[PDB]
Symmetry: D2
Subunit: 461 residues, 4 copies
């Protein structure tokens, strides 16, 4: 009798359920929270709007929140990141989900509205779980009355956290948020090792190209850039790295990479003459990891080696100037989320043309677009933090506080290190690792409790 959903094929639910059962055995921290908190039901009464990639891993996150007492309405934060068997299994469980792989931009917006509205009217939501900030901005711009009764936002990714901090700076953030990205068991696990696992994964599934012996250029060397560069280098690629941050560039040099710039002397003056055409003429694969705009621009695309692969693993697809390629070049679909971009003109192409580029996921997040994103055992850390962040903000009950009390708690904060450590401990135990217990003398020698926390907040790991 349940119809409050829209997925690609509900008959895929049994397959999704089999994969959810597997993923549970791969996510000990998330399943540890399920057992620890099921009796006390900390999310009883919570009504969570969720917008994050509708994968098998998100499925385990959704059912954990529900198991702790929440009701949810869910959509994906990307048009290509949904796993249809995951969405089908969630909808089969009676959970409102509006997501499928290959949405159009209009369908993407429609799916978010379907979570916001129930039976044509605003849902009685009181919590928000977001990845990238799209759902968060729509609520602020269009549904401010709903935010009055929402207790908090838990944001997954670097880009979303940037947008939250902009709203806080401008005095336009309406409810407090927890920066889930900057838990060490998120940023230094998800962003880095997740992309290490899934970047070459997506490139292989999309192209089946040998990577060993070829030239790669990674734009950026943050957490995603670090993991992305290792994903290619461990496959045998000759990887060069571009960065605007000299500290990250220093790490790239020390990690054994040649730090280069697409522009002569690193100065992009807007002309084709500032492009290091000799450098780009050798690159077989360029990956953007910056969260910035136009870091693989039109003039870089013009100068790339013939038949090079172009992909983005940053959150939004404007890191590559795909708009330029649509306006000027002919797109030939090899298969879903794999396109040959013929640089010979806009209208038509010789099917045996050799002057083309291969674009993955149409410039969207390549790991989730052409593969399945991060593996369950890595997302275990990010999503255990998500559950702890939902519990924390829901227990605070910001929406119920008076005006003078709301003002003292309107912030974008991170979880305490003690909880960060406790998530990490379950992850380590999941590998069969054994952490040593400090003796009382040792604990006093380095000035910490035997239980932790073991590092000051300034520690960078």
């Amino acid at each position: 009798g349940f119809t409050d959903y829209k997925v690609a094929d509900i008959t895929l639910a049994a397959w999704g359920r089999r994969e959810l059962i597997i993923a549970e055995s791969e996510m000990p921290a998330l399943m540890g929270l399920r057992r620890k908190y099921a009796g006390q039901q900390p999310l009883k009464g919570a009504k969570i709007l969720g917008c994050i990639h509708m994968t098998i891993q998100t499925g385990v996150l959704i059912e954990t929140l529900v198991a702790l007492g929440a009701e949810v309405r869910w959509s994906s934060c990307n048009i290509f990141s949904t796993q249809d068997q995951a969405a089908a299994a969630i909808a089969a469980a009676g959970i409102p989900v509006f997501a499928w792989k290959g949405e159009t931009e209009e369908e993407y917006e429609w799916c978010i509205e379907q979570t916001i509205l129930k039976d044509g009217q605003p849902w009685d939501a009181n919590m928000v779980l977001d990845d990238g900030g799209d759902l968060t901005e729509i609520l602020h711009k269009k549904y401010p009355q709903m935010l009055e009764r929402i207790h908090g936002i838990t944001e997954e990714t670097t880009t979303g956290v940037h947008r939250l901090l902009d709203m806080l700076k401008n005095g336009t953030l309406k409810v407090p948020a927890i920066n889930v990205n900057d838990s060490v068991t998120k940023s230094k696990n998800d962003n880095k090792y997740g992309c290490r696992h899934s970047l070459n994964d997506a490139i292989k599934r999309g192209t089946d190209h040998l990577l060993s012996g070829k030239q790669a250029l990674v734009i950026g060397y943050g957490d995603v850039g670090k993991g992305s560069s290792q994903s290619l280098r461990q496959e045998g690629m000759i990887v060069k790295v571009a960065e605007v941050d000299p500290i990250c560039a220093m790490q790239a040099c020390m990690d054994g990479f040649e730090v280069v710039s697409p522009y002569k002397n690193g100065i992009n003056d807007g002309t084709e003459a500032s492009i290091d055409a000799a450098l780009l003429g050798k690159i077989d694969l360029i990956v953007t990891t910056t969260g910035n705009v136009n870091v693989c621009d039109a003039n870089m695309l013009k100068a790339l080696k013939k038949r090079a692969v172009v992909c983005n693993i940053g959150h939004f697809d404007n890191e590559i100037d795909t708009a330029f390629m649509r306006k000027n070049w002919a797109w030939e679909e090899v298969k879903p989320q794999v396109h040959k971009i013929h640089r010979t003109g806009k209208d038509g192409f010789d099917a045996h043309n050799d002057d083309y580029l291969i674009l993955l996921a149409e410039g969207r997040l390549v790991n989730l677009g052409n593969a399945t994103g991060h593996p369950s055992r890595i997302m275990d850390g990010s999503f255990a933090n998500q559950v702890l962040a939902q519990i924390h903000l829901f227990e605070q009950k910001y929406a119920d506080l008076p005006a003078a009390e709301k003002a003292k708690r309107l912030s974008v904060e991170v979880l305490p290190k003690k909880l960060d450590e406790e998530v990490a401990l379950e992850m380590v135990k999941g590998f069969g690792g054994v952490v040593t217990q400090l003796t009382p003398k040792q604990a006093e020698y380095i000035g910490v409790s035997v239980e932790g926390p073991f590092k000051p907040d300034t520690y960078r790991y």
Copy 2:
């Protein structure tokens, strides 16, 4: 024309000068500071007490301070870390230096005193550069009147910073200090990549042991532990990692290491029954990296595989219970800083005994004891921060300020991120790396200045 020094062999000065000239070509950030601030002469009047490993790298640091206007009196912070040709070259340049490789503990204390006192009476020092805090504590415990004329302390390493913070929280810190260690171009360069370069280097010079295919156990996975594990793994060792911090252990698992404890279930009950004898019976090499006490204890040493190598790369030698071995086991010197510890007895050993351990540098920090420590191009980052930290505190002139302003500036702080980035930039240029310059639109997009700083202070890299 100069006789206020004490080195092992002044005839080594020409050799040391030849290596100093090479090291300058390997330290562009430090030498870059030398030229930029040369005419300004910002350290004129500075009289710096310096206590840090008297290596060739420290030699370039000393002559950078002198070139900027400073007068110094120097000693080493470790008995085995001095390079005798470096100390000879410094002494030959008319700089008071009291350091040589192979000091006794008595001679170690005498060397720090020869810097503190000039011609029988206390020097009119006004600045302090320290590595580990031994000189800092002597000043506070034995020469507190000299601290009245001292403007600040610049501390190199993790252990010294811990001691600085303890004095601050007890109200005993007499002068402000700069945590040079927690610059990213220090901790995430020196502590990590330095030990990656110099750990296997020191193990090779001491034993010439093949490392590939053997079993290692690294105690600790902080910055030193991360670099030490990679030093051994990149040589092909099978590395297991012990940690008390679950977050660091999580990093170790994701980095591809098995996380183990020397104690069953990680619980040391002080008894041999708690030792995982099967695990330690397979370890060919153990390395301590914790900055903690007794992390390789007497019971672990008894259970270690025969002929296993024992060494420490933390700052102080008490990470290993060498006192137990001195009390109970016979020591056979193979060569300087290499001993066979025969577990068959104290008062004699069969020349062909098979039941022994190999101890490097008598438990003192092994990279400087059995090799030359970190390479010049890495210490470039650390010591560019040291010079900047000295310039900062000396310009503050804390000692000449009223009491109301003294208590306001009495702190242990780090250099601004902007200087951290400018140090990193010179290091990248030294590799031939080219950093990209943000366009104005990109800088506005991510909310930074084109000049930087490029990261929020919370960023962990």
Copy 3:
């Protein structure tokens, strides 16, 4: 009106053609032969029975053989290795092909018969291209008269060559063969680096398991074992290696792997008491690479850690005792070529049972069964050797020769080193690599020609 084929779905032909166009640009050695030999038509009159994995890469091989003048009738040598879009593209080109992914065993035997028979009568073939030797043995055991007109066999893989050598020493081999496997551009490219690329690829596609931090056991350390071990180790797995060959075990040790046996002291007495249960109880992934029988036996499977992944990348599925699992344990299909094997027994599994193993491709070649096998740029080397071998034996015309001179040519040979090098050179050029030309003085100095061959036949590379 061409209907002489059987594929899964001919409407996939255009997709396959798009991927064949890309594959051609990834296979410069194969496409170089196609253009070097097109006008000469060296395979005019050749009628080739081909039996090898019907992949995109095989498609480029087939169309190369056709472009040089040959007629072919093709099947796949494995029930799971066909790429249906590749089979469709070939069938759409008017080429008899009988292959689809997911054949039953009876359909597999039927497909080879459809190549052997045209219109119910034995085809007038004169060449054989084989991978594994199944087609070769059927011709010898069932169609011997057909071998009177066959000029030669070109065998792709290690297992197939073993079978050819057994027939040669028994005097049952009726036509000469070329050992394509033992070209250096095959065995030391395909067998090693191919599995390096495609082993972790298949495991990710089948399970999406995180590999970093988990425990793997690779049975065997030949060419396939070496590449498989590197596939897992580069992902951060802790890899242990098993071997019966001490020389190969020595290489594993030096490469940084712990060498272990599933049996106590390496002695398999057939009892569970000989299984090293403590070792296998920690293994998350076992991979067989031996070409031998029952190297992952029933008692090993009983002792494996719960939820461990089991797969074989050797040629035949009897490396793992899947017959035991099919007889005693309950199989739950997750998706095609992914089965959970519940060790709770044979009569009903619980969907939430935790005591299962995950078997990939039902024990068949996992890289081809769960992914797409080796990438085009690697198969370029193997299939360029295939073309040269087919040319060589077809030119010899063994079947049209005197009996005395036929006996002089009945042999299992490898291609000459000069052609091996010429294949490698085109692969090197495909990477943009530039080899150096020896000067005549240098060529004399080492006793070679400037043109090569550069190594004696004893050289092992």
Copy 4:
């Protein structure tokens, strides 16, 4: 007492003996032969002329030969490769040895003659152990009557085997020889992994340069070139590889290296204009590994980046045109075996000249000249083959055979694979590895004995 020796410092004997006792525990194959054969005395009556690097490892080899019953007279095959404490320890055991680190070329020849002659007349030698072929050449050209009574030669290295085969081809080889180099436990252990261990080791001891993030060019990708490339890559260097063998170049590409040539298009046109100056102007370190002549020629040396390090790890120094640098450029000794080559003129140099190269070991093999060569556990394999080869040829008694029998046995051969495997087995056991024993069914399946040999002679490993 005993005076039949010449070494640097006899008082180093005790230190050398302590390191010999350690090395015995690192060489289980060599010590296993000592244990297995001591009672049989297989070398009773053997009188071995030995010319090979007088290291600690050669010391264990010498004492194993003596322990099996032989007498020896020894010299080093390189002027810089002797460890003076090893030579002193051997002389102190009453064994004739003529070697010291830092010989002149004239002293090198004198040392070899001191082994050949005892008390001014030819020694009653009957066996030869050689590394490089210098001793072999002198006997053929100057002492042919001694070769009448010599039963054979055991040659260690690739360059020496080449010289043997030249003499055999020309009919000038007077006694049979065993190619020790081409045992797999030699060439694929010593040549590869030995240089992996000792190349970066020697570069660090000589220069203490940071290697990570810098540019290397390895000339050659044979066994030594493969090991040398890994030695630099595992340290974080950006390694480019040069080769003339396209098969070896193919392996470099697949191993993740860019394959380049010092000459434009790989062609030397006899002028500086054919030098890729852009490439060489970026190289921080060049290593020659070829066994060829002038692979780092004068014009390459002129175009190398300022302050680049230049070293050779081939057997002979003529891989680098050191003669050109001697004639044209000023040499400044940094320290023993480390020279700055000032490219500003032959006359003199400014101490602060930036235009110099750093040459290690004056172009002689750098691992032995600037460090200690391969570690004991690797040399265990090579030198166990040496002992077995000495036994095999001494037992054959070629010198006592009639002319007609000599003709049937005058050859350059390798040890049988069975012995190669038994050497490997002891090396594997030294790591704690456990080799699996084949079942009788498994042995029959792959067609080998359960005892081995396990591979055909064609197998390349």
